[PDB]
Amino acid sequence: ALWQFRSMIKCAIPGSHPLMDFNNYGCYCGLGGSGTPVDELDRCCETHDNCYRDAKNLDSCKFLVDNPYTESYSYSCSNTEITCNSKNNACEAFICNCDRNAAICFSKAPYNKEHKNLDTKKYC
Numbered sequence: 001a002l003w004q005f006r007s008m009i010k011c012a013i014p015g016s017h018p019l020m021d022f023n024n025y026g027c028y029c030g031l032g033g034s035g036t037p038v039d040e041l042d043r044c045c046e047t048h049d050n051c052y053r054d055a056k057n058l059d060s061c062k063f064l065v066d067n068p069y070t071e072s073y074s075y076s077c078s079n080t081e082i083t084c085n086s087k088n089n090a091c092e093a094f095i096c097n098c099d100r101n102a103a104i105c106f107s108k109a110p111y112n113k114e115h116k117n118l119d120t121k122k123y124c
């Protein structure tokens, strides 16, 4: 679920709490998404959006109001190391992994301040 995703991100990137703020990043980091990713970090979010999209397509899965972000799963954090609980059901496991991959992608991408709260109606 969204809040778990936030938590999962702080795990892989400690000094990140202040960035989940009211803000949004690039063309895909936030909700919706349109046009083309503006950089590596934004591409991570686009990839994550496509991942959720694949989840919504699994005929064996149905999420509340078709929003994978509502799906709560179980996961644990070690030393910035994320582990998805094997007890999660198939649908939850897919989401957990999407969130995990994104968290890892985020930790490796550069953060470009000029993309914070980018005017999406203009540049996306």
Ligand SMILES: C[C@H](CCC(=O)NCCS(=O)(=O)O)[C@H]1CC[C@H]2[C@@H]3[C@H](O)C[C@@H]4C[C@H](O)CC[C@]4(C)[C@H]3CC[C@]12C
Binding pocket: 005, 006, 009, 013, 015, 016, 019, 020, 021, 023, 024, 025, 028, 029, 030, 031, 041, 045, 106, 107, 108, 109, 110, 111
């Ligand atoms: C993980 C990211 C932090 C940047 C950063 O500190 N990089 C450091 C890199 S390095 O260590 O210096 O290499 C932040 C940037 C904007 C954040 C996103 C935005 O705040 C929009 C969204 C807010 C929601 O509460 C959670 C998902 C949501 C989609 C956030 C995921 C985390 C992001 C992608």
Ligand SMILES: [Ca+2]
Binding pocket: 071, 072, 073, 092
């Ligand atoms: Ca659940």
